[PDB]
Design a protein around this ligand. Structure first.
Ligand SMILES: NC(=O)c1ccc[n+]([C@@H]2O[C@H](COP(=O)([O-])OP(=O)(O)OC[C@H]3O[C@@H](n4cnc5c(N)ncnc54)[C@H](O)[C@@H]3O)[C@@H](O)[C@H]2O)c1
Ligand SMILES: Cc1cc2nc3c(=O)[nH]c(=O)nc-3n(C[C@H](O)[C@H](O)[C@H](O)COP(=O)(O)O)c2cc1C
Ligand code: SF4
Ligand code: FES
Ligand code: NA
Lengths: 160, 417
């Protein structure tokens, strides 16, 4: 039942301080910090907002409103690698369905679901700005065009 | 070493914005300098701010971010108000079909940086921002690196080239909200807040970042500025139609042989974009419609319009999504509805509920589950997203869909069945 108070490890905290020192005002760093936290933990820990707020020198409710507004930041699910799949036009014309199916075949999950392992989550997103090379998806920061199931499987094998 | 990105095809007839960016790789500062880079900056710092605003005005450069507002006139509004002032490059590009800005950022970042420095000097801004969408991580890192390269050469920092002009460029990242592309919403996000648009007026040039005079310009707009300084405003005007000067980037997608970004003059027609440059349609199927991103729908009878900012022109961002005879217009309309559903910030009630209901009713129409009342409700909602709206999203969230209803009634009637 007991839980340890939340702290950022030092390596992560250093990067957060870097972002906070980067802009002329501290509170401008909020999104860079949240991006950094999500890549580190595979999500946004609810406990993490209070320490972040103190570093940003903001009220907690401010940070809470920001996290809520940008739904891409995920407080509910932990996933090491987020597979962002474009479900927009014109990707829908160029075979988003095929990609989704291949993802389901390989990983056994549908959009919005996380693997039991907890390493992969499929997130449906709007246009990724790579429409000429549709259908399009991202694995964390890396971005690729989908060709075939075997091609997709090889790409995914690179994330471990 | 940057995150993987797709290989977007690029082609140019003008060899200006895509001189380097037609090749899919990062052009670093040494290579940029070799091609004559940062010389326009040096020439600009030898001119007065007022002279630069004048050249950009006389060039007839218009905003490349969708609204087509005269850039020079925008800057003049900013400088009529006391400083300090801020300059913002808008790199949020999140509209369906639109990928023109990313190829400049990822392949020729110094072209954008040079334009930002010149533009900042013009309006007397010592602090500048690039706001790049979060789904462009490579662009973010590429810009961060290019800015440091420029600083080391003395194009940024204090006392640039002995001019006594100081500039720092900061790169901020979005977090998955299209609305942050709206200029007032962008400014809110830069202040560390939710991307909620503000009531306009005032315009950012009057009251923007920290309530100070602020110019917001699109990436593509700013990329024109080095050329205007380098060539002079008159030679720039000789590019393209007398009325709509300069090169323009057209991201072309959908069922074309050669999807990608084309740098063309704005007297090019939509038919030429698709058939002459993009190589026609896959399987030589007839064109049914073109979606100007999520803003407008053109039918096959409208292919001879110019790609300019005239009343009868294509306008927008020059985004060309091509649909063929086989592609379902209702299905496509649903995707546009879904886009607006996901992107409304929710501040305004008719926008909030209208965008939601438009998508949900259209989905039922598409699945053949819609009642007669659903049909009437869909029609009503489509026409009533705009009331009380404080930004452009509410004004246009039903525009494209309404045009499909008007231009493809026979196709809609089958779903009525
Ligand atoms: C995209 O986005 C577009 C909508 O963008 P928007 O809402 O920013 O367009 P808008 O027409 O409100 O403004 C376009 C640009 O011109 C500026 N502007 C307009 N009127 C001005 C004035 N009187 N004084 C000073 N500056 C002025 C705005 O600040 C903005 O930067 C759509 O057309 C779509 O294609
Ligand atoms: C909902 C919405 C989204 C927008 N998204 C963008 C965008 O991604 N990039 C952009 O440059 N302008 C975008 N705009 C337009 C900007 O508000 C603004 O007009 C533009 O950035 C000004 O630059 P320009 O004069 O160089 O075009 C958007 C407008 C609205 C209403
Ligand atoms: S019109 Fe829509 S997107 Fe614009 S501020 Fe209102 S609710 Fe937000
Ligand atoms: S519609 Fe998928 S990348 Fe644009
Ligand atoms: Na690119």
């Amino acid at each position: 039942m007991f839980k340890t108070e939340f702290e950022f490890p030092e390596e992560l905290k250093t990067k957060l301080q870097e972002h906070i020192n980067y802009f002329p005002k501290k509170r401008q760093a909020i999104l860079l910090c949240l991006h950094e936290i999500q890549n580190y933990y595979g999500y946004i820990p609810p406990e993490s907002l209070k320490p972040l707020a103190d570093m940003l020198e903001l009220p907690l409710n401010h940070v809470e409103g920001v996290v809520a507004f940008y739904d891409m930041f995920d407080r509910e699910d932990k996933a090491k690698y987020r597979i962002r799949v474009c479900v927009s036009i014109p990707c829908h014309l160029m075979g988003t369905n095929k990609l989704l199916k291949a993802l389901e075949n390989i990983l056994g999950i549908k959009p919005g679901e996380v693997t039991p392992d907890g390493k992969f989550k499929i997130v449906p997103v709007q246009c990724l700005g790579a429409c000429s090379e549709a259908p399009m998806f991202m694995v964390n920061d890396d971005e690729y065009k989908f060709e075939s199931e075997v091609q997709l499987n090889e790409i995914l094998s690179r994330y471990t | 070493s940057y995150p993987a990105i797709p290989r977007i095809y690029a082609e140019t007839t003008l060899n200006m914005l895509l001189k380097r960016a037609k090749k899919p790789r990062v052009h670093s500062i040494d290579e940029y300098l070799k091609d004559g880079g940062y010389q326009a900056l040096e020439k600009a710092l030898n001119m007065s701010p007022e002279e630069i605003i004048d050249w950009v005005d006389k060039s007839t450069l218009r905003g490349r971010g969708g609204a087509g507002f005269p850039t020079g006139k925008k800057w003049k509004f900013a400088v009529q108000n006391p400083g300090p002032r801020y300059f913002i490059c808008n790199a949020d590009e999140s509209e369906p079909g639109t990928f023109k800005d990313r190829i400049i950022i990822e392949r020729d970042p110094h072209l954008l940086i040079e334009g930002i420095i010149i533009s900042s000097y013009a309006i007397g801004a010592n602090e500048a921002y690039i706001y790049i969408r979060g789904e462009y991580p490579a662009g973010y890192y590429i810009l961060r690196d290019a800015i440091e390269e420029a600083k080391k050469k003395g194009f940024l920092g204090k006392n640039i080239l002995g001019s006594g002009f100081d500039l720092e460029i900061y790169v901020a990242r979005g977090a998955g909200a299209y609305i942050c592309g709206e200029e007032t919403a962008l400014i809110e996000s830069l202040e560390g807040k939710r991307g909620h648009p503000r009531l306009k007026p005032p315009y950012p040039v009057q009251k923007g970042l920290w309530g100070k005079p602020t110019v917001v310009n699109n990436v593509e707009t700013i990329a024109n500025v080095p050329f205007i300084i380098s060539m002079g405003w008159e030679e720039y005007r000789y590019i393209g139609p007398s009325d709509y000067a300069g090169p323009k980037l057209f991201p072309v997608s959908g069922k074309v042989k050669k999807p990608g970004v084309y740098e063309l003059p704005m007297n090019t027609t939509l038919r030429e974009v698709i058939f002459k440059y993009a190589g026609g349609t896959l399987g030589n199927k007839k064109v049914k419609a073109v979606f100007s991103g999520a803003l407008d729908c053109f039918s096959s009878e409208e292919l001879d319009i110019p790609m300019d900012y005239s009343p009868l022109g294509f306008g927008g961002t020059g985004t060309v999504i091509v649909l063929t005879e086989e592609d379902d217009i209702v299905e496509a309309a649903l995707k546009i509805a879904e886009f607006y559903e996901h992107e409304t910030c929710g501040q305004c009630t008719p926008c909030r509920v209208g965008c939601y209901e438009q998508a949900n009713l259209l989905e039922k129409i598409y699945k053949g589950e819609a009642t007669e009342q659903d049909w009437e409700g869909f029609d009503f909602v489509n026409r009533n997203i705009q009331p009380t709206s404080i930004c452009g999203l509410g004004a246009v969230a039903g525009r494209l869909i309404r045009q499909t209803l008007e231009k493809f009634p026979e196709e809609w009637e089958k779903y009525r069945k």
